[PDB]
From a paper:
We generated 12 structures of the F11 TCR, that recognizes a peptide from the influenza hemagglutinin protein (PKYVKQNTLKLAT) presented by HLA-DR*0101 (DR1-PKY), between 1.58 and 1.89 Å resolutions; 5 structures of the DR1-PKY specific HA1.7 TCR, between 2.31 and 2.98 Å resolution; and five structures of the 003 TCR, that recognizes an HIV-GAG-derived peptide (SLYNTVATL) presented by HLA-A*0201 (A2-SLY), between 1.26 and 1.37 Å resolution. Indeed, the CDR loops of the third TCR included in our study, the 003 TCR, were superimposable in all the structures solved. The 003 TCR structures, which exhibited practically identical CDR coordinates, were solved at an average resolution of 1.31 Å. Finally, none of the 003 TCR CDR loops, which were identical in each structure, made any potentially stabilizing crystal lattice contacts. However, we observed several CDR loop re-organizations between structures for the HA1.7 and F11 TCRs, while all structures of the 003 TCR were identical at the level of the Cα backbone. In order to determine the appropriate Ecut for TCRs, we performed rigidity analysis using the 003 TCR at cutoffs of −2 kcal/mol and −3 kcal/mol (data not shown). Analysis at a cutoff of −3 kcal/mol, but not −2 kcal/mol, demonstrated that the structure was largely flexible, with very few large rigid clusters. Although this analysis is an approximation and should be treated as such, the average maximal loop motion was slightly less (6.4 Å) for the 003 TCR compared to F11 (8.7 Å) and HA1.7 (9.0 Å), consistent with the structural data demonstrating greater rigidity in the 003 TCR. On average, the 003 TCR CDR loops moved slightly less compared to the F11 and HA1.7 TCR CDR loops, in line with the structural analysis.
The key molecular interface that enables T-cells to sense these threats is mediated by the clonally expressed T cell receptor (TCR) that classically distinguishes between self and foreign peptides. The TCR governs T-cell specificity by discriminating between self and foreign peptides presented by MHC molecules. One key feature that is likely to facilitate this level of cross-reactivity is flexibility within the TCR complementarity-determining region loops (CDR loops) that form the antigen contact zone. The finger-like CDR loops of the TCR are thought to meld around specific pMHCs, sampling the peptide cargo, and enabling T-cell triggering by ligands with sufficient affinity/dwell-time.
Residue numbers in the entry:
A (entry chain A): 1 to 15, 17 to 203
B (entry chain B): 1 to 244
The structure:
């Protein structure tokens, strides 16, 4: 029979602190082990748990995974999620003479922003660039950043930075263009942004 | 600190029809070496596993994908007659025993197969200094670094402040954005932020550098275009703090 490994959800976005459930299933129960891994962007995989076919569960830290071999299932439980858990989580099984990986759960654990201060700032032009650059920053993690209506306006997704020695985390998205009919006042018009976002005078 | 799994080379750009050979060295004491291909469309797919110099298990790749293992457990794989769809992250994993012991992966060799080396461009890199309004409203100062117009996506961006590499206050996009989303040869852009206190930004002795390493053509690749050969290189931009 043909082994098929399935993982759900494909993507998971949750507030930090919440417990998480990652599901894996396999159609051929004749496995020697099941293994869970994380992978960060631009990196290889790190082994989290290996459950032998004769075992029902393994634990390490905040991670616990079960194996129900006859049912063809494993569940990974991540307690008390942290931003540093953000990664793609991969389930794999070892069969008699083959190895099979699921397609992954892409997990994003969002920081709790304690004092949102949403704003859109204009950065200074560079003397060695032709771009106009705008920064939407300091919004709550519930804010979603959309792409521009315009194909020559570039917008990145929210990215969280941590200023460690200040106990401070912040979200931001960058927009830029070298078109001339472009202003930071308009750059994020295709996103639903907070009504109290601060737009300083240029 | 003891070595993890090592892989060589880290980045390759090839044209269609060429061949490549990749190496992996296991963790000391691991004897099982496995190869996997990771693509966006097919995910991680098993190639083959070696133990004590012989292939123990194999996937479903055609015969133009091959491997081998030397007596000190180092392993090579080879791909001949390269196709565009061979572009992937080629991962090695070592294990004491793949049946009952964890797989330890390397960081991969990134291969890009392109129609033509004239598709390859290094990034342009620029830093954009903070907004005055940010400084007055928050007492913080965000620098932005943009790396734009590069192909393929073989870049590493890092920030350096007074010569030391920083991770606090930084966030770099996890993936780049395609400048022209519908085209297979599209050039890419990447953004990153570095946030400091207003007091740190206001000291003109503080120096900020955004570094982008780009892994490009080999000295053995032929180049006959007018523009500079897009070899492996660093492209950087910098700023100094300012009191006002």
């Amino acid at each position: 029979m043909k082994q098929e490994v399935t993982q759900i959800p494909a993507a998971l976005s949750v507030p930090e602190g919440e417990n998480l459930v990652l599901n894996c299933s396999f159609t051929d129960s004749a496995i020697y082990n099941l293994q869970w891994f994380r992978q960060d962007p631009g990196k290889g995989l790190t082994s989290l748990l290996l459950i032998q076919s004769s075992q029902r569960e393994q634990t390490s830290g905040r991670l616990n995974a079960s194996l129900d071999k006859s049912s063809g299932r494993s569940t990974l439980y991540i307690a008390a999620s942290q931003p540093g858990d953000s990664a793609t989580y991969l389930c794999a099984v070892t069969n008699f003479n083959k190895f099979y990986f699921g397609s992954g759960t892409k997990l994003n654990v969002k920081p709790n922003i304690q004092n949102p201060d949403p704003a859109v700032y204009q950065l200074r032009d560079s003397k060695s660039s032709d771009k106009s650059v705008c920064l939407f920053t300091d919004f709550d993690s519930q804010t979603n950043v959309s792409q521009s209506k315009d194909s020559d306006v570039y917008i990145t997704d929210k990215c969280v930075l941590d200023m460690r020695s200040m106990d401070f985390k912040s979200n931001s998205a960058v927009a830029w263009s070298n078109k001339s009919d472009f202003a930071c006042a308009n750059a994020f018009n295709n996103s639903i942004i907070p009504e109290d976002t601060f737009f300083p005078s240029p | 600190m003891k070595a993890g799994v090592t892989q060589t080379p880290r980045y390759l750009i090839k044209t269609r029809g060429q061949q490549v050979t990749l190496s992996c060295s296991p963790i000391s004491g691991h004897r099982s070496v496995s190869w996997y291909q990771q693509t966006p469309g097919q995910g991680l797919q098993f190639l083959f596993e070696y133990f004590s110099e012989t292939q123990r298990n194999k996937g479903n790749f055609p015969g133009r994908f091959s491997g081998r293992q030397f007596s000190n457990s180092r392993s090579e794989m080879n791909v001949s007659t390269l196709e565009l769809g061979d572009s992937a992250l080629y991962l090695c994993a070592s294990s004491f025993d793949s049946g009952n012991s964890p797989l330890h992966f390397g960081n991969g060799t990134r291969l890009t197969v392109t129609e033509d080396l004239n598709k390859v461009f290094p990034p342009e890199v620029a830093v954009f200094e903070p907004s005055e309004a940010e400084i007055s409203h928050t007492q913080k100062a965000t620098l932005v670094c943009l790396a734009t117009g590069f192909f393929p996506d073989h870049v590493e961006l890092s920030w350096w402040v007074n010569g030391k590499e920083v991770h606090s206050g930084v966030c770099t996009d996890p993936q780049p954005l395609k400048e022209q989303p519908a085209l297979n040869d599209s050039r890419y852009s990447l953004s990153s932020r570095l946030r400091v206190s207003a007091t740190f930004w206001q000291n003109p002795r503080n120096h900020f550098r955004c570094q982008v390493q780009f892994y490009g053509l080999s000295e053995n690749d032929e180049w006959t275009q007018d523009r500079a050969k897009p070899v492996t290189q660093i492209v950087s931009a910098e700023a100094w703090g300012r009191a006002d």
